[PDB]
Amino acid sequence: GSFLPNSEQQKSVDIVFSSPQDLTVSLIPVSGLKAGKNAPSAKIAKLVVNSTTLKEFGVRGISNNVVDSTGTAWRVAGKNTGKEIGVGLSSDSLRRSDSTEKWNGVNWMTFNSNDTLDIVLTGPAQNVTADTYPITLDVVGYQP
Amino acid sequence: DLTVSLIPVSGLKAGKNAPSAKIAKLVVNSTTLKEFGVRGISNNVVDSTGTAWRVAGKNTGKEIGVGLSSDSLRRSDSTEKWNGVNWMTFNSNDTLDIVLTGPAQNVTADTYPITLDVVGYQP
Amino acid sequence: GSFLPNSEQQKSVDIVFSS
């Protein structure tokens, strides 16, 4: 038998595990909130994230006192008097979360970019005072 | 002459994939010739006959094992030399899968290239 | 698997409990 060298052909394709991805960002206070003994799991803000069915995003708590490795548990001090209050993503939102991702080692907690993740006073309840309390969130397109 | 087509598999998953997960399906139809030989082509071929080789993720620059399946290697007619260089021959108008060689490999979430020299043969 | 600093975004709001 024999091999025909004129019929040889190099053929080529790519196999695609497409990491690339992005996300959208905005945050809204809900009004009608009162001082003193609030409820457990009382919603006070709403991270809004939706778009062309985009897939994941990453988020952390941003303050002087962040208190977790994974991300997403922090405290915030007021403006007028300066008492601290616990804050956090909701207990439903931590079950919606997708992963704990490690940007060059830096943890970020991840979520499907298709939600209204609600922020809550996490704990037992807190006897909060009539005062301002800012919040900050860094948000990132974690790529799957 | 031959009429070749290489077809990627869809729905593949980043990270840990099934043992031998199917990644592509080579197709070789031909009217005139009964058979064809085939090897893979890369910067690191890992056997004498050229049917197991390695390739890497483009965005991240990391390797994966690739090659003909243990089912596909058993469909070969014979091993035949072309001036000493081996080529496992296979019947024309047939399909041969490409798989992640070795156990359940970890696919690092990227794009990977493949290149295959196919050549005819006439027993 | 990865992170685009291009979309590492910051966002802040003021909450006020009344009393």
All domains in chain A, ordered by first residue: 27-140 (2.60.40.1570)
Question: What one-letter code names the amino acid at A15?
Answer: I
Alpha-carbon distance of A44 to A33, in angstroms, equals 8
Beta strand C2-3 with B94-99: parallel, antiparallel or unpaired? unpaired
Q: Which helix (H) or strand (E) segment is C3 a member of?
A: strand C2-3
Chain mean position to CA B73 = 10
Q: Which residues of chain C lie closer than 8 angstroms to B61, CB-CB? A: none
Chains that touch A (3 or more CB pairs under 8 A): B, C
Residue with tokens 């803000």: A45
B84 φ, ψ (degrees, to nearest 5): 80, -15
Residue with tokens 């207990």: A91
List the alpha helices (DSSP H) in chain A: 91-96
Residue with tokens 């799957």: A144
Burial (CB count within 10 angstroms: exposed 0-12, middle 13-18, buried 19+), residue B109:
buried
Residue with tokens 């001036």: B83
Question: What are the residues whose beta carbons fall under 8 Å from the beta carbon of A141, sequence distance 6 or more?
Answer: A21, A22, A23, A56, A57, A58, A113, C3, C4, C6, C7
Question: What are the residues whose beta carbons fall under 8 Å from the beta carbon of B106, sequence distance 6 or more?
Answer: B15, B16, B17
**Do residues B57 and B109 touch, judged by C-beta distance below 8 A?**
yes
Closest to A120 in 3D by CA, of A92, A100, A141: A92
B113–A1: do the CB atoms touch at under 8 Å?
no
Alpha-carbon distance of A59 to A142, in angstroms, equals 9
A22–C14: do the CB atoms touch at under 8 Å?
no
Alpha-carbon distance of C6 to C1, in angstroms, equals 16
Q: Both tokens of residue B16?
A: 């840990």
Among the partner residues A26, A131, A139, nearest to C17 by beta-carbon distance = A131
Closest to B60 in 3D by CA, of B109, B114, B101: B109
Among the partner residues A44, A141, A142, nearest to C15 by beta-carbon distance = A44
B107 φ, ψ (degrees, to nearest 5): -80, 105
Alpha-carbon distance of A22 to A113, in angstroms, equals 8
How many Cβ atoms from other residues are within 10 Å of residue A89's Cβ? Answer: 23
Q: Both tokens of residue B80?
A: 């035949």
Q: What angle do CA C11, C8, A134 make, to 5 degrees?
A: 20
C5 φ, ψ (degrees, to nearest 5): -50, -35
Q: Both tokens of residue A36?
A: 């003193």
Q: Both tokens of residue A127?
A: 């006897």
CA closest to A140 among chain C residues: C8
Resolution for this PDB entry, in angstroms: 17.0
Technique behind the model:
cryo-EM
C1–B14: do the CB atoms touch at under 8 Å?
yes
A135–C15: do the CB atoms touch at under 8 Å?
yes
**Do residues B1 and A7 touch, judged by C-beta distance below 8 A?**
yes
How many Cβ atoms from other residues are within 10 Å of residue B31's Cβ? Answer: 9
Beta strand C9-16 with A132-140: parallel, antiparallel or unpaired? antiparallel
Alpha-carbon distance of A98 to A109, in angstroms, equals 8
Question: What are the residues whose beta carbons fall under 8 Å from the beta carbon of A129, sequence distance 6 or more?
Answer: A35, A78, A81, A83, C17, C19
